[PDB]
Design a protein around this ligand. Sequence first.
Ligand SMILES: Nc1ncnc2c1ncn2[C@@H]1O[C@H](COP(=O)(O)OP(=O)(O)O)[C@@H](O)[C@H]1O
Ligand SMILES: [Mg+2]
Ligand SMILES: [Mg+2]
Lengths: 694, 42
Amino acid sequence: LSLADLMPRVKVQSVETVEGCTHEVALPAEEDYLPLKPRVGKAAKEYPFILDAFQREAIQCVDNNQSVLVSAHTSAGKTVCAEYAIALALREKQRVIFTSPIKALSNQKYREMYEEFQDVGLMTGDVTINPTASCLVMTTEILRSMLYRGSEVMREVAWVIFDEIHYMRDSERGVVWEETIILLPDNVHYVFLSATIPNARQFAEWICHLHKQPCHVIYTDYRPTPLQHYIFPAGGDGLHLVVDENGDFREDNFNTAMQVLRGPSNVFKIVKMIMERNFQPVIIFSFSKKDCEAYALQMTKLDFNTDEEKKMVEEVFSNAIDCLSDEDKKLPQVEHVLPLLKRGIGIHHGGLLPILKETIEILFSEGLIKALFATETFAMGINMPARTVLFTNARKFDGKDFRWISSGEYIQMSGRAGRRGMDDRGIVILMVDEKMSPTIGKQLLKGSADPLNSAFHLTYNMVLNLLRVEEINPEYMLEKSFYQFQHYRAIPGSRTVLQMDELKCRKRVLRRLGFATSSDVIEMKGRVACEISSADELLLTEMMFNGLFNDLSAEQATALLSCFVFQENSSEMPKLTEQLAGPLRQMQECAKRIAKVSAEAKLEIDEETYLSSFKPHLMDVVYTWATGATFAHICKMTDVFEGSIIRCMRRLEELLRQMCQAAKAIGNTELENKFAEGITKIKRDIVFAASLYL
Amino acid sequence: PIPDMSKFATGITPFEFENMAESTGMYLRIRSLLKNSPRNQQ
Ligand SMILES: Nc1ncnc2c1ncn2[C@@H]1O[C@H](COP(=O)(O)OP(=O)(O)O)[C@@H](O)[C@H]1O
Ligand SMILES: [Mg+2]
Ligand SMILES: [Mg+2]
């Protein structure tokens, strides 16, 4: 039991507004509420359209230099609010940061903002452009690195814009995200952009608790293009309206749809119906890469594009892959997509070559793709809506069980229907292949979005860096996490600081292994771990200090490191020569010892599970790639999707850069040059082709 | 509450601008090919 000495002192003030949005502000309880004042001076930015009420309200917060969370549907125009903050920051000769959860999205946002402000830069784990720009688009991992390293780039930052904060949990950046918010100085102000969430007030209260300033909440359910929701029961012939433009559930038509009950071919039928009724463009969401490719190939009978549209596709496609080497242009996936795209049929999932995924995004965004078969991730793409959204399945598998998709997932995906300007309505069609009650059907089609819940948890890199930095300690970040704040608010009156027991056990591990002293002073070994964030910092450092890397060549080390960034749980194990199986056995022995130390420190951990997380299914793929093979060659060595190979290679290159810094921290120029050589041996060709958005 | 940035910078390797690059001109090249697309006409 560790009770908090000082508790949050926050109150929330309601602010009346004209119809069409809600405005609240969390502020320190001891302070008086002061209404916002009219803009002094000219608008930082003007728009060629009439701003909506919620945009004007959010913009007034920025004009008054106060932080604001904007919670609205994707399509309502949240980016307008970010653009005003950027414009105001540049006018004032300040710097502003725009963070996205994903690298792919940062690339898209860099293009969008550069085309608007020019004075824009980009910083991801894969590229750096114009790093002295006034507006820096970056990933949340980069921002975390700059903060923990005290980069002077942050000294002139007046505004930080967090985009799509509701997606931070699913993006794997849940912890990194809260770390950046907690480490930013109190003089910085924020624009948080979120989908509609039921606990927006709670988040603003946390920001107020954190930085001792007001944080506003602008919330609206406004949808510029109303939606109509249909169910297409299996075997049926038509569509049944179950939610009309006004949001009223049609319990009669719903049961009539279930009546038809009381799926490759079904997908073709419904898609064809969509095209005959001029309901296209359509996005067909499937929760499986394979389903996307199968369904797409079933549309080969059809052709959606005009001759002039075919020419545009062909020209764009050739110009895009022209940067590739003649060897990579001939890859089977490259040759397989173009016939589809020419017919207005597209595919979008993580298994795709990034250069093709970006080509397909740009084509769909320009209307040259009328039927896009995509996985859920496509919903997070910017400015790519359709007239119709089709769900091929109402159930998914979250690694646990077949559950109906949540209302939040349905809202996120179904919200990509309705193109403002050229669509009077947005059409949503939910394919249903089994029985389902009106209750859960109303929850799914009419339930509210999911709350934004903290994904914060302790990491060794976090603990060590906070031990390292003077005038701060790991306990500070625990008490200030949103995870801890949600506990305070869910259980009023409780002062118990969660995660303390875990903090003590984790420090015991660090002491027993020489990362820090009994007095929690950081050892040089710990400072090496401070450099590693994208992988298991504890195990990799122990491996470095035990010498596992000293006898390995660059190719062996690179191949061995792939086990720390490869994340696919349904692959077949290849056969490894002793050059790879040897190092793999050494790493596993070391992992066992850490598991032992962890258990004795009283951390919950399973040895076999822990050892299994380091998946070597691409060790040979990576090794052969590093020895100069072609990409076509290494794809033949595995069932792993081409895009999944490239994703692992890109995270591997990112990890290698961190291992260089790790070796550099102790002047070990031997390993530094070795890890750097691995980078030189994998950073080439289509696997590292530049983003089409640059 | 949060120590100054200078205190975070001491005892750790600095943040490096890695993977430097410049505009390939690819996007604006693809954009020129798309003057009369279904979205540019509407
Ligand atoms: N108030 C408005 N009136 C008309 N069009 C708007 C308005 N706000 C945004 N838009 C337009 O709507 C499109 C999508 O808006 P966007 O900023 O992508 O929404 P969000 O990013 O919040 O989902 C853009 O092309 C933009 O120009
Ligand atoms: Mg609600
Ligand atoms: Mg400290």
